[PDB]
Amino acid sequence: DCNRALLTRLHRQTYARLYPVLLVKQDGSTIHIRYREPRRMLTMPVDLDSLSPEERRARFRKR
Amino acid sequence: DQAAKDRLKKRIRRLEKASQELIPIEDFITPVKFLNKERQRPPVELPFEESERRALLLKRWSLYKQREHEMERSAIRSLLEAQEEALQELRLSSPELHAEATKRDPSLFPFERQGPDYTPPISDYQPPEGRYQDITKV
Amino acid sequence: YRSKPTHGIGRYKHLVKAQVRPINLGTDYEYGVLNIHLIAYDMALAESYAQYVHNLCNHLAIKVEESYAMPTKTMEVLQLQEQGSKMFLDAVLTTHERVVQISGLSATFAEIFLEIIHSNLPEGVKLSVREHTEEDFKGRFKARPELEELLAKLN
Amino acid sequence: SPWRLLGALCLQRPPLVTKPLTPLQEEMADLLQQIEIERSLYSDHELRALDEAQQLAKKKSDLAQDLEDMWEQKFLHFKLGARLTEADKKDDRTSLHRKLDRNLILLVREKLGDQDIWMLPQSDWQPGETLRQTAERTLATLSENNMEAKFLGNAPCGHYKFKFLGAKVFFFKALLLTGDFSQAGKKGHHVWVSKEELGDYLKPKYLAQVRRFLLDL
Amino acid sequence: RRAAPLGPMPNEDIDVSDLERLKKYRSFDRYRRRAEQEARKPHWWRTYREHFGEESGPKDRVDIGLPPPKVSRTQQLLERKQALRELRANVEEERAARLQTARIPLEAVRAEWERTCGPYHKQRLAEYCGLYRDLFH
Amino acid sequence: VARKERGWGTVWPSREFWHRLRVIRTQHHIEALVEHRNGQVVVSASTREWAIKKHLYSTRNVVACESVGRVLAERCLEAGINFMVYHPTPWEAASDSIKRLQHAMTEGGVVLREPRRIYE
Ligand SMILES: [Mg+2]
């Protein structure tokens, strides 16, 4: 039942050419996204770490 | 002194009586750069085989959509009939129970849910580091 | 005419009108003005699922208040380059939010309705259902720097 | 008429992975992509590629492809997650991570003194309690696990009676948000099951029409 | 002074309260259909039909004619249904309907009209032209 | 030299005619009428008729409107009525089916927009 509203187009008059780019969040999941600049893969990066995770990120960057 | 507070309260009243006009929506407005990228876009002569395949596929899609809407409406009707005979059964069971169960709970107020994705989340995966800078115009 | 039995045969203004709190009563709990937010990075999925939600409301006879759109939130993807402590530009990620403003339902039809919504969520759509507060109404409106300047001069 | 008091719960697992397209939706997706290309007003990547092409043609008469190769290479280097966590194990109906496409429901197995039941999880409440909190304490107690599950609301959904004296049963419906099941190899037989092999497994007349208010999807 | 109406008001059936729940027509064509349906009913007030020559209104028409042909309704319906299914079975019918290029044999249409409903149509032309009025009243 | 019913104007359509073409486009069938000012129907061509119904395909089409127009034009020539007034709605005037139905009426030989009254 997740396939109901997926089958659609852009209904506007003037619009650029879009591409089915696969995006990943801070996890293993992928989502199909109409996005320009026809790269096949797009990734989202880790932000700000945490108070006890900034030191772990610094240690991972050092190692 | 007090005259400063008088002209101040005059200012809050005067800029309060102005309009609360909305932000424009970017998506409803065609951008300016989209004008001159049309001269090298030629029309495509659509062949008859492609046109008839598109048309018959549209007829099959319309029939399938009508049938799928019909079974979704049948499912919601079955759920509603079950819930009708259900509330009748509980009302015949106990008065205090339908006094309690006709509520919408305050825990429903932050109802948030995320749609399913293409691939499942994998374990032991480390995406790289980065930052986000908000360029949304205010 | 007044004295005739055919008086008021031309009466029409009582049939067409042309000139919000939740009502919590204890037995019939009709709850008022809610916003259903549909958040996606893709134009087609956001607009089509807003269309599907609005058409489902029209079929299920909810008096819909509005069907509107939030302004776009443009996130920027700056990533850390390999072998360096450098930032490079990767993606311009636009976030679009299509919101359906519904007036009133019941609790029963809230289980039915939200069950159909998260059964029918497409790929890459974040669902949110909340009430109508002051902040959700102020979200479509621009900043008020002159009013914050006046309030800061007050304080 | 004496009444015997039983709640019950319907613990719905949401799908994680979208289902594959039927062939009619696949060919409609092809049509929709074709008409998006037909109505598309080019792109900044294709404009640059055409401009570089015509300037190199004019220079030889008198890069976008590198980016294409790099993007395809970084796509081919990346391996995606496995869509099929079902067929690689092919035996376990017990695990929470069993099926990703369909909706899943929980059953547990108990042997009674006078009955042998294959049962959706149920309850028992003293009359001072409310059935919503009864379902919450049942979920917190009987499965000995940390299931952060969002209940839908106060209104019940499943409603069946069997009379000996009568005995009365009220199924609720509640959706899982996040889960943590301790002691995965416990002796209590719990199964996460979908609608078709649910219909295969469930014998009773009272539990035969749980599919009436379970969504088919 | 107020008097009592002799019969029902036209718009008293629908509820004044809760206007949002009542379904609306949004089509002027739907209003045209509804108004032309409403104008043909015998209202109790003074009407155009009463004053402008409806030719006695309801008239008990004495029929001096041949019996209608007795045709089996179920057999007629099933043969019409089977002919329709064999007509929609073709693909070239779909092609001719879509591409706006299809013709009908008007001579065969005229023949089947003369067999089927031509009697009733000629009866209403004779009624309109007053053939019955000046011959058989 | 007969009396037309001049007047009205606040209502629509104008009732100043001897014969009027009435096209009812139902979601299934297409039904055209030639109506006198009395309200009686003179000649009608509908796709509810079995005589047309076994001859056309897909009762709703523009081609169905063409069949209706040609059949009613032939029936009007058979009934001796050659003039009528057609008053379409401005969104029905731009439609494909009504325009080519008027084309079929013109090619059929029925001239729309009735002649002016003598000493009106
Ligand atoms: Mg019959």
PDB file of C-alpha atoms in Angstrom, chain B residues 8-9 11-12 15-16 18-28 65 69 72-73 76 79-80 83 87 98-99 101-106 108-119 128-136 138, chain C residues 25-27 29 31 34 43 47 52 56 59-60 69-80 87 96 98 107-108 110 112 114 116 118 120-131 140-144 146-147 150 153-154:
ATOM      1  CA  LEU B   8       7.231  53.372  22.453  1.00  0.00           C
ATOM      2  CA  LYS B   9       3.708  52.053  23.152  1.00  0.00           C
ATOM      3  CA  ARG B  11       5.154  52.200  18.106  1.00  0.00           C
ATOM      4  CA  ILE B  12       4.105  48.715  19.331  1.00  0.00           C
ATOM      5  CA  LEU B  15       3.417  48.134  13.961  1.00  0.00           C
ATOM      6  CA  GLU B  16       0.930  45.707  15.549  1.00  0.00           C
ATOM      7  CA  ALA B  18       0.048  46.415  10.305  1.00  0.00           C
ATOM      8  CA  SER B  19      -0.517  43.236   8.309  1.00  0.00           C
ATOM      9  CA  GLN B  20       0.803  39.773   9.199  1.00  0.00           C
ATOM     10  CA  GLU B  21       1.747  38.995   5.558  1.00  0.00           C
ATOM     11  CA  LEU B  22       2.977  35.532   4.597  1.00  0.00           C
ATOM     12  CA  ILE B  23       6.417  34.454   3.417  1.00  0.00           C
ATOM     13  CA  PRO B  24       6.457  33.637  -0.322  1.00  0.00           C
ATOM     14  CA  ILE B  25       6.686  29.990  -1.337  1.00  0.00           C
ATOM     15  CA  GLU B  26       9.702  29.178  -3.509  1.00  0.00           C
ATOM     16  CA  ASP B  27       8.072  26.127  -5.082  1.00  0.00           C
ATOM     17  CA  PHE B  28       5.020  27.979  -6.420  1.00  0.00           C
ATOM     18  CA  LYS B  65      -6.777   2.320 -10.158  1.00  0.00           C
ATOM     19  CA  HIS B  69      -9.708   2.253  -4.940  1.00  0.00           C
ATOM     20  CA  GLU B  72      -9.389   0.061  -0.375  1.00  0.00           C
ATOM     21  CA  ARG B  73     -12.890   1.468   0.162  1.00  0.00           C
ATOM     22  CA  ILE B  76     -12.214   0.775   5.176  1.00  0.00           C
ATOM     23  CA  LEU B  79     -13.104  -1.849   9.346  1.00  0.00           C
ATOM     24  CA  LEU B  80     -15.874   0.704   9.962  1.00  0.00           C
ATOM     25  CA  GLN B  83     -15.909  -0.916  14.642  1.00  0.00           C
ATOM     26  CA  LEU B  87     -18.826  -0.103  19.878  1.00  0.00           C
ATOM     27  CA  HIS B  98     -17.957   3.375  26.794  1.00  0.00           C
ATOM     28  CA  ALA B  99     -17.827   6.368  29.126  1.00  0.00           C
ATOM     29  CA  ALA B 101     -13.338   4.519  25.717  1.00  0.00           C
ATOM     30  CA  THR B 102     -14.862   7.402  23.706  1.00  0.00           C
ATOM     31  CA  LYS B 103     -11.728   9.517  24.298  1.00  0.00           C
ATOM     32  CA  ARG B 104      -8.843  10.578  22.123  1.00  0.00           C
ATOM     33  CA  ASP B 105      -5.769  10.246  24.282  1.00  0.00           C
ATOM     34  CA  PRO B 106      -3.366  13.183  24.848  1.00  0.00           C
ATOM     35  CA  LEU B 108      -1.837  11.001  20.325  1.00  0.00           C
ATOM     36  CA  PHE B 109      -0.933  14.724  20.077  1.00  0.00           C
ATOM     37  CA  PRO B 110       2.721  14.279  18.890  1.00  0.00           C
ATOM     38  CA  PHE B 111       1.834  11.624  16.307  1.00  0.00           C
ATOM     39  CA  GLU B 112       4.922  11.223  14.111  1.00  0.00           C
ATOM     40  CA  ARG B 113       5.766   8.374  11.749  1.00  0.00           C
ATOM     41  CA  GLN B 114       8.352   7.786   9.029  1.00  0.00           C
ATOM     42  CA  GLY B 115       7.740   6.082   5.707  1.00  0.00           C
ATOM     43  CA  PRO B 116       9.512   2.884   4.661  1.00  0.00           C
ATOM     44  CA  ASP B 117      12.739   3.112   2.673  1.00  0.00           C
ATOM     45  CA  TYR B 118      14.268   1.212  -0.242  1.00  0.00           C
ATOM     46  CA  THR B 119      16.879  -0.800   1.695  1.00  0.00           C
ATOM     47  CA  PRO B 128      31.694  10.347   7.395  1.00  0.00           C
ATOM     48  CA  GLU B 129      31.606  13.624   9.300  1.00  0.00           C
ATOM     49  CA  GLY B 130      30.274  16.986   8.158  1.00  0.00           C
ATOM     50  CA  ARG B 131      28.278  20.117   8.908  1.00  0.00           C
ATOM     51  CA  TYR B 132      25.050  21.696   7.649  1.00  0.00           C
ATOM     52  CA  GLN B 133      24.713  25.437   6.979  1.00  0.00           C
ATOM     53  CA  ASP B 134      21.202  26.845   6.667  1.00  0.00           C
ATOM     54  CA  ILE B 135      20.794  29.030   3.571  1.00  0.00           C
ATOM     55  CA  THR B 136      16.998  29.294   3.886  1.00  0.00           C
ATOM     56  CA  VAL B 138      14.451  34.927   5.999  1.00  0.00           C
TER      57      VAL B 138
ATOM     58  CA  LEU C  25     -17.796  17.418  26.320  1.00  0.00           C
ATOM     59  CA  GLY C  26     -17.128  13.958  27.797  1.00  0.00           C
ATOM     60  CA  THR C  27     -19.321  11.674  25.649  1.00  0.00           C
ATOM     61  CA  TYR C  29     -15.471  14.299  21.956  1.00  0.00           C
ATOM     62  CA  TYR C  31     -11.628  17.740  18.625  1.00  0.00           C
ATOM     63  CA  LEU C  34      -5.414  19.840  13.219  1.00  0.00           C
ATOM     64  CA  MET C  43       8.444  17.400  -4.998  1.00  0.00           C
ATOM     65  CA  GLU C  47       2.573  16.879  -3.730  1.00  0.00           C
ATOM     66  CA  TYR C  52      -4.022  11.577  -1.866  1.00  0.00           C
ATOM     67  CA  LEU C  56      -9.207  10.670   1.061  1.00  0.00           C
ATOM     68  CA  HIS C  59     -14.225  10.836   0.186  1.00  0.00           C
ATOM     69  CA  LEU C  60     -14.429  10.301   3.959  1.00  0.00           C
ATOM     70  CA  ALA C  69       2.464  24.324   1.954  1.00  0.00           C
ATOM     71  CA  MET C  70       5.220  25.359   4.367  1.00  0.00           C
ATOM     72  CA  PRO C  71       8.194  27.349   2.980  1.00  0.00           C
ATOM     73  CA  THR C  72      11.138  25.255   1.816  1.00  0.00           C
ATOM     74  CA  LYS C  73      14.020  24.493   4.177  1.00  0.00           C
ATOM     75  CA  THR C  74      17.294  24.289   2.258  1.00  0.00           C
ATOM     76  CA  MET C  75      19.937  22.214   4.041  1.00  0.00           C
ATOM     77  CA  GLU C  76      23.503  22.309   2.737  1.00  0.00           C
ATOM     78  CA  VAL C  77      25.724  19.216   2.757  1.00  0.00           C
ATOM     79  CA  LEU C  78      29.308  20.179   3.596  1.00  0.00           C
ATOM     80  CA  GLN C  79      31.457  17.084   4.060  1.00  0.00           C
ATOM     81  CA  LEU C  80      34.887  16.465   5.549  1.00  0.00           C
ATOM     82  CA  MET C  87      35.184  21.174   4.001  1.00  0.00           C
ATOM     83  CA  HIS C  96       9.352  20.525   1.385  1.00  0.00           C
ATOM     84  CA  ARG C  98       2.775  19.893   2.470  1.00  0.00           C
ATOM     85  CA  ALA C 107     -11.616   9.477  18.306  1.00  0.00           C
ATOM     86  CA  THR C 108     -12.875   6.322  16.543  1.00  0.00           C
ATOM     87  CA  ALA C 110      -8.837   8.979  14.422  1.00  0.00           C
ATOM     88  CA  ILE C 112      -9.260   4.501  11.430  1.00  0.00           C
ATOM     89  CA  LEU C 114      -4.256   7.418  11.121  1.00  0.00           C
ATOM     90  CA  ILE C 116      -4.964   4.261   6.824  1.00  0.00           C
ATOM     91  CA  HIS C 118       0.585   4.995   7.990  1.00  0.00           C
ATOM     92  CA  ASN C 120      -0.490   4.294   2.868  1.00  0.00           C
ATOM     93  CA  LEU C 121       2.725   6.269   3.507  1.00  0.00           C
ATOM     94  CA  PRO C 122       4.960   6.230   0.405  1.00  0.00           C
ATOM     95  CA  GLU C 123       8.732   6.017   0.292  1.00  0.00           C
ATOM     96  CA  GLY C 124      10.588   8.929   1.876  1.00  0.00           C
ATOM     97  CA  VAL C 125       7.672  10.752   3.522  1.00  0.00           C
ATOM     98  CA  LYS C 126       7.815  11.809   7.169  1.00  0.00           C
ATOM     99  CA  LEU C 127       4.324  11.971   8.680  1.00  0.00           C
ATOM    100  CA  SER C 128       3.423  14.381  11.461  1.00  0.00           C
ATOM    101  CA  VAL C 129       0.000  15.012  12.999  1.00  0.00           C
ATOM    102  CA  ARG C 130      -0.414  17.878  15.454  1.00  0.00           C
ATOM    103  CA  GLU C 131      -2.950  20.438  16.627  1.00  0.00           C
ATOM    104  CA  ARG C 140       4.097  30.735   7.586  1.00  0.00           C
ATOM    105  CA  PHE C 141       4.746  34.285   8.649  1.00  0.00           C
ATOM    106  CA  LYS C 142       7.877  36.339   8.222  1.00  0.00           C
ATOM    107  CA  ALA C 143      10.136  37.507  11.038  1.00  0.00           C
ATOM    108  CA  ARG C 144       9.325  40.568  13.093  1.00  0.00           C
ATOM    109  CA  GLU C 146      11.010  45.654  14.355  1.00  0.00           C
ATOM    110  CA  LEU C 147       8.779  44.009  16.980  1.00  0.00           C
ATOM    111  CA  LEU C 150      10.575  47.219  20.365  1.00  0.00           C
ATOM    112  CA  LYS C 153      13.755  48.235  24.174  1.00  0.00           C
ATOM    113  CA  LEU C 154      10.877  47.374  26.527  1.00  0.00           C
TER     114      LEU C 154
END
